C-alpha cells in the first residue's frame, strides 16, 4: 500500500484505488496501473521533473529503503493477475531489488523528489510506475 499526496491531488495504484478515489476521480489508466483522485486537504509530496536513473524506493515487506538502479519509463509485458489480464503495462522502469505484491504504493525517490510507485515485481526485480511525465500534478 502507499500514495503520493501532491497539491490537491492523491496518486494511488488503479488496480489499489478504493471507492471513494473512484468517486472523486481525476484520470485514471489501466495500462499505466496508475489512478489519480482529488482531496480537500493539501498534499505533504514534491514530484521529480529529471531524467535520473538511480533513487532510493520504501520496501515494505522488508520496512527498510533500498538505493537502486532502474530502467528508463517503457512498455514491459506484465503476465495475467486478478486484477489485470496478461497485458503491456507502459511507463514502467525495472530494478533489480526485493519486492512482494503487497509492497505496490512504496514511493520511489531521488534528490529531485518523487519519480513514482511500486506496480510489479517478482523474482528480485521490482517495476515502478513512473509520475514525473504528468506534469499537471504541480497546478
Ligand atoms: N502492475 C500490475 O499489473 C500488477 C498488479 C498487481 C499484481 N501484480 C504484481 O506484479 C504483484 C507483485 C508486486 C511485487 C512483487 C511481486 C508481485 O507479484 C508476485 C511476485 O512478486 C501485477
Ligand atoms: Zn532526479
Same mark, same amino acid.
Given at each position: @500500500?502507499? &500514495?503520493? %499526496?501532491?497539491? #490537491? ?12 478515489? $473512484? &468517486? #472523486?476521480?481525476? $484520470? ?19 514530484? +521529480? ?7 532510493? %524506493?520504501?520496501? @515494505? @515487506? ?6 537502486? @538502479?532502474?530502467?528508463?519509463?517503457? =512498455?514491459?509485458?506484465?503476465? +495475467?493477475?486478478?486484477?489485470?489480464? +496478461? ?7 525495472? &530494478? ?11 514511493? =520511489? ?13 517478482? #523474482?528480485?526485480?521490482?517495476?515502478? &510506475?513512473?509520475?514525473?511525465?504528468? =506534469? $499537471?500534478?504541480?497546478?
Amino acid at each position: @500500500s502507499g &500514495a503520493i %499526496y501532491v497539491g #490537491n491531488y492523491r496518486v494511488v495504484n488503479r488496480h489499489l484505488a478504493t471507492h471513494n478515489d $473512484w &468517486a #472523486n476521480l481525476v $484520470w485514471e489508466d489501466s495500462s499505466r496501473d496508475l489512478l489519480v483522485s482529488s482531496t480537500t486537504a493539501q498534499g505533504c509530496d514534491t514530484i +521529480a521533473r529529471c531524467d535520473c536513473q538511480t533513487g532510493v %524506493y520504501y520496501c @515494505s @515487506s522488508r520496512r527498510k529503503h533500498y538505493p537502486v @538502479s532502474f530502467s528508463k519509463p517503457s =512498455l514491459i509485458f506484465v503476465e +495475467a493477475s486478478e486484477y489485470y489480464p +496478461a497485458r503491456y503495462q507502459s511507463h514502467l522502469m525495472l &530494478a533489480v531489488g526485493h519486492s512482494e505484491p503487497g509492497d505496490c504504493g512504496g514511493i =520511489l525517490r531521488c534528490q529531485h523528489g518523487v519519480v513514482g510507485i511500486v506496480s510489479t515485481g517478482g #523474482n528480485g526485480l521490482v517495476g515502478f &510506475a513512473d509520475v514525473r511525465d504528468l =506534469l $499537471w500534478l504541480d497546478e
